[PDB]
Design an enzyme around this catalytic site. Structure first.
Site, PDB file in Angstrom:
ATOM      1  CB  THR A  56      -0.968  -0.074   1.377  1.00  0.00           C
ATOM      2  OG1 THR A  56      -0.030   0.257   2.354  1.00  0.00           O
ATOM      3  CG2 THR A  56      -1.925  -1.204   1.580  1.00  0.00           C
ATOM      4  N   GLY A  57       0.306   2.473  -0.271  1.00  0.00           N
ATOM      5  CA  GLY A  57       0.935   3.724   0.083  1.00  0.00           C
ATOM      6  C   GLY A  57       2.259   3.794  -0.699  1.00  0.00           C
ATOM      7  CE1 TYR A  58       4.583   9.030  -1.399  1.00  0.00           C
ATOM      8  CE2 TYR A  58       4.791   9.237   1.066  1.00  0.00           C
ATOM      9  CZ  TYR A  58       4.769   9.975  -0.073  1.00  0.00           C
ATOM     10  OH  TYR A  58       4.483  11.407  -0.566  1.00  0.00           O
ATOM     11  CG  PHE A  79       1.840  -8.207   8.628  1.00  0.00           C
ATOM     12  CD1 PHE A  79       2.329  -9.263   9.127  1.00  0.00           C
ATOM     13  CD2 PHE A  79       0.690  -7.746   9.336  1.00  0.00           C
ATOM     14  CE1 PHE A  79       2.016  -9.937  10.315  1.00  0.00           C
ATOM     15  CE2 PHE A  79       0.361  -8.651  10.549  1.00  0.00           C
ATOM     16  CZ  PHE A  79       1.004  -9.698  11.180  1.00  0.00           C
ATOM     17  CG  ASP A 116       6.846  -9.308  12.198  1.00  0.00           C
ATOM     18  OD1 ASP A 116       6.993  -8.270  11.780  1.00  0.00           O
ATOM     19  OD2 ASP A 116       7.184  -9.737  13.190  1.00  0.00           O
ATOM     20  CB  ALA A 117       9.038  -6.902   7.396  1.00  0.00           C
ATOM     21  CE1 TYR A 240       7.144  12.335  10.962  1.00  0.00           C
ATOM     22  CE2 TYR A 240       4.875  11.557  10.833  1.00  0.00           C
ATOM     23  CZ  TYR A 240       6.079  11.362  10.450  1.00  0.00           C
ATOM     24  OH  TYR A 240       6.484  10.180  10.025  1.00  0.00           O
ATOM     25  CE  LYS A 249       9.500   8.179   9.531  1.00  0.00           C
ATOM     26  NZ  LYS A 249       9.456   6.974   8.543  1.00  0.00           N
ATOM     27  CB  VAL A 279       0.458  11.091   0.458  1.00  0.00           C
ATOM     28  CG1 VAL A 279       1.025  11.909  -0.899  1.00  0.00           C
ATOM     29  CG2 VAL A 279       1.485  10.251   1.019  1.00  0.00           C
TER      30      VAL A 279
HETATM   31  N1  LIG Z   1       2.127   8.825   4.558  1.00  0.00           N
HETATM   32  C1  LIG Z   1       2.651   9.820   4.322  1.00  0.00           C
HETATM   33  O1  LIG Z   1       2.313  11.125   4.345  1.00  0.00           O
HETATM   34  C2  LIG Z   1       4.133   9.696   4.437  1.00  0.00           C
HETATM   35  C3  LIG Z   1       4.769   8.444   4.899  1.00  0.00           C
HETATM   36  N2  LIG Z   1       6.039   8.232   4.766  1.00  0.00           N
HETATM   37  C4  LIG Z   1       6.935   6.876   5.355  1.00  0.00           C
HETATM   38  O2  LIG Z   1       6.704   6.249   4.248  1.00  0.00           O
HETATM   39  C5  LIG Z   1       6.716   4.866   4.759  1.00  0.00           C
HETATM   40  C6  LIG Z   1       5.521   4.143   4.359  1.00  0.00           C
HETATM   41  O3  LIG Z   1       4.364   4.892   5.009  1.00  0.00           O
HETATM   42  P1  LIG Z   1       3.027   4.823   4.181  1.00  0.00           P
HETATM   43  O4  LIG Z   1       3.076   4.464   2.716  1.00  0.00           O
HETATM   44  O5  LIG Z   1       1.967   5.950   4.710  1.00  0.00           O
HETATM   45  O6  LIG Z   1       2.235   3.406   5.189  1.00  0.00           O
HETATM   46  P2  LIG Z   1       1.287   2.442   4.596  1.00  0.00           P
HETATM   47  O7  LIG Z   1       0.088   2.094   5.688  1.00  0.00           O
HETATM   48  O8  LIG Z   1       0.636   2.690   3.281  1.00  0.00           O
HETATM   49  O9  LIG Z   1       1.934   1.206   4.352  1.00  0.00           O
HETATM   50  C7  LIG Z   1       2.680   0.407   5.282  1.00  0.00           C
HETATM   51  C8  LIG Z   1       3.277  -0.725   4.678  1.00  0.00           C
HETATM   52  O10 LIG Z   1       4.077  -1.429   5.591  1.00  0.00           O
HETATM   53  C9  LIG Z   1       3.853  -2.704   5.799  1.00  0.00           C
HETATM   54  N3  LIG Z   1       3.730  -3.395   7.015  1.00  0.00           N
HETATM   55  C10 LIG Z   1       3.380  -2.857   8.345  1.00  0.00           C
HETATM   56  N4  LIG Z   1       3.877  -3.648   9.188  1.00  0.00           N
HETATM   57  C11 LIG Z   1       4.606  -4.562   8.637  1.00  0.00           C
HETATM   58  C12 LIG Z   1       4.882  -5.749   9.025  1.00  0.00           C
HETATM   59  N5  LIG Z   1       5.280  -5.814  10.389  1.00  0.00           N
HETATM   60  N6  LIG Z   1       5.752  -6.822   8.138  1.00  0.00           N
HETATM   61  C13 LIG Z   1       5.699  -6.628   7.147  1.00  0.00           C
HETATM   62  N7  LIG Z   1       4.807  -5.465   6.288  1.00  0.00           N
HETATM   63  C14 LIG Z   1       4.348  -4.634   7.191  1.00  0.00           C
HETATM   64  C15 LIG Z   1       2.430  -2.926   5.112  1.00  0.00           C
HETATM   65  O11 LIG Z   1       1.773  -4.042   4.718  1.00  0.00           O
HETATM   66  C16 LIG Z   1       2.379  -1.660   4.251  1.00  0.00           C
HETATM   67  O12 LIG Z   1       2.666  -2.445   2.975  1.00  0.00           O
HETATM   68  C17 LIG Z   1       6.755   5.030   6.248  1.00  0.00           C
HETATM   69  O13 LIG Z   1       8.276   5.116   6.811  1.00  0.00           O
HETATM   70  C18 LIG Z   1       6.364   6.551   6.645  1.00  0.00           C
HETATM   71  O14 LIG Z   1       6.819   6.966   7.552  1.00  0.00           O
HETATM   72  C19 LIG Z   1       7.070   9.570   4.557  1.00  0.00           C
HETATM   73  C20 LIG Z   1       6.429  10.751   4.167  1.00  0.00           C
HETATM   74  C21 LIG Z   1       4.945  11.024   4.439  1.00  0.00           C
HETATM   75 NA    NA Z   2       4.302   1.739   2.213  1.00  0.00          NA
END
Ligand SMILES: NC(=O)C1=CN([C@@H]2O[C@H](COP(=O)(O)OP(=O)(O)OC[C@H]3O[C@@H](n4cnc5c(N)ncnc54)[C@H](O)[C@@H]3O)[C@@H](O)[C@H]2O)C=CC1
Ligand code: NA
Length: 404
Positions: A56-58, A79, A116-117, A240, A249, A279
């Site tokens: 998902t996401g980034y 996960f 679990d990564a 944050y 971070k 985002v």
């Molecule tokens: N969302 C935002 O505005 C921003 C996010 N980020 C960073 O980008 C990174 C990703 O964030 P998002 O895209 O927002 O999050 P998200 O919730 O969309 O994705 C999280 C991902 O981590 C995986 N995940 C979580 N726990 C896991 C585990 N124990 N084992 C395996 N996979 C696991 C999920 O399956 C998913 O693929 C983070 O480090 C976040 O801090 C950086 C800038 C801003």
């Molecule tokens: Na992600």
């Protein structure tokens, strides 16, 4: 009789949607793929990519960018919950099913590992997959967002805290259920809460990953790894950057030293922290102030023609900075992709609006409409061309999915 299928609608409470639509998630993944292919190829990218947090996401956007932009074979770790009869799986499951479908259509390798990564077991399964299929990987994307981490040794469970540090803070926000602008006081994190947050969202596990791949010899020469971070506008700093999650971070900025040290002795590898914009994701929606902040930011940036979501942001990160000839570095050696959010004029406008918004002018002052739309899109709802009236089988299977 007809029990195998269902009509799936959103079920939303706060920043939680407990359903996801398989067809809609597929169409959402296709939209991001089509963005990348329309923007065009990215030259000199990695050809074998491991994405940790790929569903998902980034991280999904990084997987799509690497695969459909750079032409990479991709191995993803995530996960997620598979679907079953009567019980929709998570959006990341359905996203990843679509990704495998579209990759195979394009003749690209796509294998995923669900588990679990943070665990040694999943690291070994990942190692096994690289050894079997790819030989080595050239790039490792670290994109985990999690509220907890079980230490792979002690078995201790750390839980993240999203609190300020030092003083309590009056934090304004938008209650998305009741559509009211209201404030609450967040107490500061204790040292234990800060340590736990650094343990979960800091850089130890990223380090553990790179070392494990290194030890197993499945990290290639000239390889690169990056972990995603957020610095944000000054208005977000209390919750944050200068809060407990910020302490985590900030640790990335330090771990990117020892990890980079390990990699640079391995054929001249490197590690960077990549700073991205705010985002709407599963993760951001859950952070205090963020639904309000995003609603305002979306409006201001749309007025400037600079609004972007995950795929636009990560595409440009790869093209400009990870693979590009004129990368955007800061004074800390971070890669920056977030400058359009941090522009002083944008910050000023967001701040002015922050102090004017009320229950009665939410729709005149903010893009809460856009926020809501993007939030629903995460789960596969509100997508063009999807017939939400049609029954669908929630049990969507994924080939080459290794279940941990
Ligand atoms: N969302 C935002 O505005 C921003 C996010 N980020 C960073 O980008 C990174 C990703 O964030 P998002 O895209 O927002 O999050 P998200 O919730 O969309 O994705 C999280 C991902 O981590 C995986 N995940 C979580 N726990 C896991 C585990 N124990 N084992 C395996 N996979 C696991 C999920 O399956 C998913 O693929 C983070 O480090 C976040 O801090 C950086 C800038 C801003
Ligand atoms: Na992600």
């Amino acid at each position: 009789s007809h029990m195998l299928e269902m009509i799936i609608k959103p079920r939303v409470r706060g920043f939680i949607c407990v359903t996801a639509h398989p067809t809609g998630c597929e169409a959402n993944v296709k939209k991001q793929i089509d963005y990348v292919t329309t923007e065009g190829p990215i030259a000199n990218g990695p050809k074998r990519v491991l994405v940790i947090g790929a569903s998902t996401g980034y991280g999904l956007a990084a997987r799509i960018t690497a695969a459909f932009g750079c032409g990479a074979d991709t191995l993803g770790v995530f996960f997620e919950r598979p679907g079953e009869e009567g019980k929709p799986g998570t959006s990341g499951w359905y996203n990843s099913a679509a990704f495998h479908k579209f990759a195979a259509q394009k003749g690209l390798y796509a294998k995923s590992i669900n588990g679990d990564a943070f665990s040694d077991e999943i690291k070994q399964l990942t190692i096994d997959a690289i050894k079997q299929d790819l030989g080595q990987v050239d790039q490792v994307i670290y994109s985990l967002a999690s509220p907890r981490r079980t230490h792979p040794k002690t078995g201790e469970v750390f839980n993240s805290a999203l609190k300020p540090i030092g003083n309590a803070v009056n934090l304004r926000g938008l209650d998305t259920d009741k559509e009211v602008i209201k404030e609450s006081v967040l107490q500061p994190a204790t040292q234990s809460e800060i340590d736990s947050t650094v343990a979960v969202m800091g850089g130890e596990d990223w380090q553990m990953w790179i070392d494990a791949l290194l030890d197993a010899g499945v990290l290639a020469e000239g390889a690169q790894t990056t972990a995603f971070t957020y610095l944000g506008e000054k208005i977000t700093h209390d919750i944050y950057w200068n809060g407990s999650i910020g302490a985590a971070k900030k640790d990335l900025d330090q771990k990117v030293l020892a990890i980079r040290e390990s990699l640079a002795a391995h054929g001249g590898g490197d590690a960077r922290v990549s700073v991205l914009k705010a985002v709407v994701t599963q993760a951001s929606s859950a952070i205090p102030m963020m639904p309000l902040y995003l609603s305002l930011l979306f409006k201001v940036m749309k007025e400037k023609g600079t609004h972007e979501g995950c795929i636009e942001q990560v595409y440009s990160l790869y093209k400009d900075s990870l693979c590009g000839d004129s990368p955007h570095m800061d004074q800390e050696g971070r890669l920056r992709a977030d400058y359009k959010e941090l522009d002083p004029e944008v910050q000023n406008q967001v701040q002015q609006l922050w102090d004017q918004v009320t229950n009665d002018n939410i729709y005149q002052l903010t893009d809460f409409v856009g926020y809501k739309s993007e939030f629903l899109n995460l789960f596969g709802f509100g997508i063009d061309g999807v017939d939400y009236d049609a029954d669908v089988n929630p049990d969507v299977k994924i080939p080459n999915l290794i279940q941990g």
